[PDB]
Amino acid sequence: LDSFEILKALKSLDLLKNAPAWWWPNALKFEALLGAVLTQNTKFEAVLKSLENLKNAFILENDDEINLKKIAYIEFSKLAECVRPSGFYNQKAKRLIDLSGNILKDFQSFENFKQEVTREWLLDQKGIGKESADAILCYACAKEVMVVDKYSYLFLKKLGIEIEDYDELQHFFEKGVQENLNSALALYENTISLAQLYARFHGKIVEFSKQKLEL
Ligand SMILES: Cn1cnc2c(N)nc[n+](C)c21
């Protein structure tokens, strides 16, 4: 039992039949970063509502560099109101404003941020935990990082492997793929990157978990 065996078994279920290519809607865009922060301690359906609020208020429009600056400089109390649906909205608004201001300060642009950001930089941003930091790296920045979470902990535990520490659980999931890299990629025909693979693999675990299925 390794993560490559799990990948194959998950892949055979076609859990992503209706999902976009990177699973996370609007992957590789500022919106994915916003979602990665907002989804902490809540359900993604609520995240989608907060995003729609930001879009309906024209805070988030089609230019990501403009959107980054909009969040860096938005009045705190206005952002807090818009992100109410995803909960912890005062904390999350501050987290997003400080994060966006710090991205501009250290990376000048969202484009450069995607290239230069590290996990440690993200972890030094107050309120950003490993899961959110990792989701930004993989789903906003196309980095070769697999997000793990409570779902993945419980999913694996059920299969007979218990890994409580976030980083060790992530390493279990990443390593099975690394160790069988050609075979993993060949499940798709060399049409996708490893980052995209982890993007989808974490997606499969989430969908499998949400669906209450049996491997
Ligand atoms: C975090 N995240 C991103 N895309 C998601 C989805 N489709 N369903 C559930 N979650 C948690 C998601």
Side-chain angles (χ1 to χ4, degrees), residues 1-16 18-42 44-48 50-156 159-163 165-188 190-211 213-215:
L1 180 70
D2 60 48
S3 72
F4 172 57
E5 297 304 313
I6 294 167
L7 174 58
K8 285 189 289 184
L10 289 180
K11 186 140 194 318
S12 75
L13 294 171
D14 252 281
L15 306 145
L16 302 191
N18 296 307
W22 282 65
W23 179 71
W24 205 292
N26 295 127
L28 310 176
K29 294 230 105 223
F30 189 60
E31 186 181 321
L33 175 156
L34 294 173
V37 174
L38 295 174
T39 198
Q40 177 194 282
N41 292 318
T42 192
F44 197 63
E45 294 54 48
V47 177
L48 290 181
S50 295
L51 296 179
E52 272 297 287
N53 283 351
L54 294 167
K55 298 190 213 210
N56 299 337
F58 314 113
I59 293 164
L60 186 59
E61 273 172 302
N62 302 306
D63 184 325
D64 278 6
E65 294 309 342
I66 288 166
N67 294 161
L68 172 55
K69 286 186 174 81
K70 283 277 181 58
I71 308 297
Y73 290 91
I74 196 172
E75 181 145 29
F76 170 80
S77 92
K78 172 154 194 204
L79 180 50
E81 280 307 300
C82 309
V83 300
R84 277 190 101 100
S86 40
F88 315 102
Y89 56 90
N90 295 284
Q91 292 167 89
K92 275 166 183 190
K94 181 59 150 40
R95 201 169 292 163
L96 288 174
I97 290 166
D98 284 347
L99 163 69
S100 298
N102 280 345
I103 287 175
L104 292 166
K105 192 199 194 206
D106 290 358
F107 302 106
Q108 297 73 51
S109 72
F110 182 66
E111 189 176 325
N112 188 53
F113 164 87
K114 297 199 264 168
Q115 175 181 295
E116 287 314 305
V117 65
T118 59
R119 199 202 209 196
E120 296 78 16
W121 190 91
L122 285 166
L123 291 176
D124 280 332
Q125 302 313 301
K126 184 151 184 176
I128 288 131
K130 282 178 183 159
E131 181 178 342
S132 291
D134 290 352
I136 290 170
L137 295 171
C138 172
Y139 294 98
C141 307
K143 299 298 188 206
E144 286 167 359
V145 172
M146 197 165 150
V147 177
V148 295
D149 53 3
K150 202 68 107 269
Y151 285 132
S152 303
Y153 172 67
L154 299 169
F155 173 77
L156 233 209
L159 301 168
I161 298 187
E162 203 194 290
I163 310 170
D165 177 85
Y166 182 107
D167 284 342
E168 300 180 4
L169 212 217
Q170 171 176 73
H171 194 48
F172 170 90
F173 272 102
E174 288 178 359
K175 67 178 257 111
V177 175
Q178 288 164 154
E179 289 161 9
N180 292 284
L181 182 60
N182 297 118
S183 305
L185 296 173
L187 302 169
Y188 303 85
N190 323 344
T191 56
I192 77 163
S193 65
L194 172 58
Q196 191 184 346
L197 194 145
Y198 287 152
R200 288 180 73 89
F201 191 175
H202 164 63
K204 286 171 204 299
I205 290 160
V206 172
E207 301 295 343
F208 176 100
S209 299
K210 265 152 105 236
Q211 270 163 240
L213 287 170
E214 194 93 38
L215 206 46

